């Protein structure tokens, strides 16, 4: 439980979980749950943000160091 990296035993051991899907949405649209590998890397349709890269650990601090207080 020391940071975002670690998880508890309970959350790690839930096999029967509702999966958020790399392609399209679990909520709607065809073929979300099957994986086509060749298509380009993009995720659930939302506001004009292309990728999940901003969800990485420590993104805000590194971005502030490099490009200042945006």
């Amino acid at each position: 439980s020391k940071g975002a990296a670690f998880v508890s035993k309970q959350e790690a051991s839930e096999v029967l979980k509702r999966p958020r899907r790399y392609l399209y949405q679990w909520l709607g649209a065809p073929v979300p749950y099957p994986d086509p590998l060749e298509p380009r890397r993009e995720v659930c349709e939302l506001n004009p943000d292309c990728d999940e890269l901003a969800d990485h650990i420590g993104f805000q601090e590194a971005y502030r160091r490099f490009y200042g207080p945006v």
Binding site: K2, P39, R40, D51, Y67, G68
Partner: protein, 698 residues
């Protein structure tokens, strides 16, 4: 004169000796089609750099100071700082522009080639067939004399203006496209493609609507989607070469590429293939097209006069002079053509040498041309770590310190991830760890099953490229026919119940924790022998075929396999909390409908007043049920409004978004080039510029 000579374009006697082969492979040929293809390829790569190569998103992928686990082919390769990466992409853009305009063609091709392969080899997760094809085409075009017609370098140099080129420039490109089509076709001669499992659900797209007038969906998903693709791959391989079958081949191939562009999000690959299709036509089609225009257009379009002699071709001398002896560049061209085509044929089937990369599929993805042949789906991923000092056991967030998710399917990427975690965890108070992985995955709708041994420490595991990995679980092809029966079980359920099918090896066991929400969960055994243990009271029951058990909700349980063969079972569960919330929401909706239509004359409860008002102002905070109802109603209205949108608005938004991407890429590149050249200013100025760069166009 001979029919074989006319059909194939060369006589048998031309192949009798090496010298005649060199002469055949360096005969004069018109340059026009090659020039048109060079222009189109340059334009498409220029459009592709700011979109798929990731220049717009590169500020959030190679950010300095961030700790990320990379996946390069060679561990020696490492990214440069962000600014030098933007300089590299700038050099790529300049090379692409030079190739498009044909200005300093060889330097432009080199400047596009070296950075492209540097970026390609740096990350294995961004590999795919249509990037490998672009790399190969850039490699081929570096040597070809594609700047002899409709090129700025022709205007700056008389000797290279509308000149002949050797035949092998066309031969290599035609061979590449033929190899792509034929290898893709043969790779799709698989049990999962000819039977209707891969791409089973793509028949529901509205583009296939006319086919449904004459065929059912089940046949439409087999005859048209699957068999049609194979037949078109082989035929488009063969038809385009011969003059008789070129028109029908062009029509079918254009239709095929347009549909692939609309159905998928592959990118510029469909347009590149469309631009490569005309090369099987005669070499001189742009010239006759230019001839068939009014004089006013001819004053602007390229030259129509016959091409002049060149020096990079072997000219047969009919003046009685002895034939021109081939020099060195001609022999090198012939050898390059033969060896390159042989290597291109060999490489897709080179998976028996690099066995370290082999998996349930064959080798790394990108250079096999097996497009849309295998579809995978993952259920669970558990990463356990044991500390080397205290002995504590803990669990990691599955997608930690990573940006892609192909590491769940390849042993080598798993080993790199394990080493990265080993180096990084000591920053988080963890000594020399031992890391274990447990990943469940199913390919083409089979039983979900482990892919790596969950009892092997990946940090200290053994891996070499040219030896088979000893901790990759085999794929059970003996359980394939069950995919029939399972589908029937998928159709026997209500709108709420859900099913998950599991197959497990002997000796191994699965520990699971049913959450409190998933009440009324059951486990049924399909084949083999298992024992289900509840740890709350330490009670284990052995289940035989066709037996069902009601598992606890909110407690741990374990399933052990105790048969000589793998055991297959199934979890069938229903989410009780969602059901109760849905019933309550339906009751509330019924009450508001009674209020609106005049019924329920009595005063409404206070908790219902926010629903009619629709706004929380000057009153108590709403209950969670009211908030959920209002959120659902607002979401439904938003979706309904989105559906009712005219086409022109969607087109305008698409154009504005693309313009935003291009503008952001250009501004970020300019900022970093200024940083490199004139140095880095204060933080406030950097923040101001970055805020300006991200602004929406409006």
């Amino acid at each position: 004169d001979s029919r074989i000579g006319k059909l194939l374009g060369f006589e048998w006697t031309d192949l009798s000796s090496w010298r005649r082969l060199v002469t055949l492979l360096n005969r004069p040929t018109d340059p026009a089609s090659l020039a048109v293809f060079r222009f189109l390829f340059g334009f498409l790569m220029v459009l592709d750099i700011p979109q798929e190569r990731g220049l717009s998103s590169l500020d959030r992928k190679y950010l300095d100071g961030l700790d990320v686990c990379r996946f390069p082919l060679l561990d020696a390769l490492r990214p440069l700082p962000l600014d030098w990466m933007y300089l590299v992409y700038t050099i790529m853009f300049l090379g692409a522009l030079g190739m498009m305009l044909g200005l300093c063609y060889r330097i432009s091709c080199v400047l596009f080639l070296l950075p492209y392969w540097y970026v390609f080899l740096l990350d294995k997760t961004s590999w795919n067939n249509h990037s490998y094809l672009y790399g190969l085409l850039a490699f081929q075009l570096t040597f070809m004399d594609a700047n002899h017609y409709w090129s700025v370098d022709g205007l700056l140099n008389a000797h290279r203006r509308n000149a002949h080129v050797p035949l092998w420039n066309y031969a290599v490109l035609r061979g590449q496209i033929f190899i792509v089509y034929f290898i893709a076709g043969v790779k799709k001669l698989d049990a999962d493609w000819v039977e209707g499992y891969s791409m089973e659900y793509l028949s529901r797209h509205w583009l296939f609507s006319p086919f449904k007038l004459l065929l059912s969906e089940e046949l439409t998903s087999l005859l048209v989607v699957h068999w049609g693709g194979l037949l078109l791959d082989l035929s488009a391989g063969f038809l385009l070469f011969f003059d008789v079958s070129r028109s029908i081949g062009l029509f079918f191939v254009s239709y095929f590429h347009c549909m692939n562009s609309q159905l998928f999000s592959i990118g510029m690959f469909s347009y590149v293939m469309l631009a490569s299709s005309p090369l099987f036509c005669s070499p001189e089609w742009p010239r006759k097209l230019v001839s068939y225009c009014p004089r006013r257009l001819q004053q602007l379009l390229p030259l129509k006069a016959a091409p002049q002699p060149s020096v990079s071709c072997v000219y047969k001398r009919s003046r009685g002079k002895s034939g021109q002896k081939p020099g060195l560049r001609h022999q090198l061209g012939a050898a390059f053509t033969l060896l390159y085509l042989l290597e291109q044929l060999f490489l897709p089937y080179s998976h028996f040498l690099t066995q370290g990369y082999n998996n349930w599929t064959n080798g790394l993805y990108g250079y096999s041309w097996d497009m849309m042949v295998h579809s995978r789906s993952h259920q669970h991923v558990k990463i356990t770590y044991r500390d080397g000092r205290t002995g504590e056991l803990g669990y990691l967030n599955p997608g930690v310190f990573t940006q892609s998710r192909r590491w769940k399917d390849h042993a080598d990427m798993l080993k790199q991830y394990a080493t990265c975690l080993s180096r990084l965890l000591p920053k988080y108070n963890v000594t020399e760890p031992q890391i274990y992985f447990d990943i469940w995955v199913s390919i083409n709708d089979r039983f979900q099953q482990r892919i790596f041994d969950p009892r092997v420490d990946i940090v200290q595991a053994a891996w070499s490229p040219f030896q088979r990995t000893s901790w990759v679980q085999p794929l059970l092809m003996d359980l394939s026919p069950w995919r029939a029966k399972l589908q029937e079980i998928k159709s026997s359920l209500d709108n709420h119940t859900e099913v998950v099918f599991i197959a497990d090896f002997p000796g191994l066991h699965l520990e699971n924790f049913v959450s409190e929400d998933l009440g009324n969960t059951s486990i049924q055994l399909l084949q083999g022998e298992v024992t289900v243990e509840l740890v709350a009271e330490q009670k284990n029951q052995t289940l035989r075929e066709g037996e069902k058990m009601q598992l606890p909700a909110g407690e741990y349980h374990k399933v052990y396999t105790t048969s000589p063969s793998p055991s297959c079972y199934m979890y069938v569960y229903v989410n009780t909390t969602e059901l109760a919330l849905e019933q309550d929401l339906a009751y509330l909706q019924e009450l508001k409908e009674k209020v609106e239509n005049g019924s329920e004359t009595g005063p409404l409860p206070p908790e219902l007043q926010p629903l009619l008002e629709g706004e929380v102002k000057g009153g108590p905070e709403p209950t969670p049920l009211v908030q959920t109802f209002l959120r659902r109603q607002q979401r439904l209205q938003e979706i309904e409004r989105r559906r009712n949108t005219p086409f022109h608005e969607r087109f305008f938004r698409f154009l504005l978004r693309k313009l935003y991407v291009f503008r952001r890429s250009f501004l970020m590149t300019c900022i970093s080039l200024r940083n490199l050249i004139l140095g880095r200013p204060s933080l406030e100025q950097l923040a101001q510029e970055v805020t300006y760069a991200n602004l929406r166009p409006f």
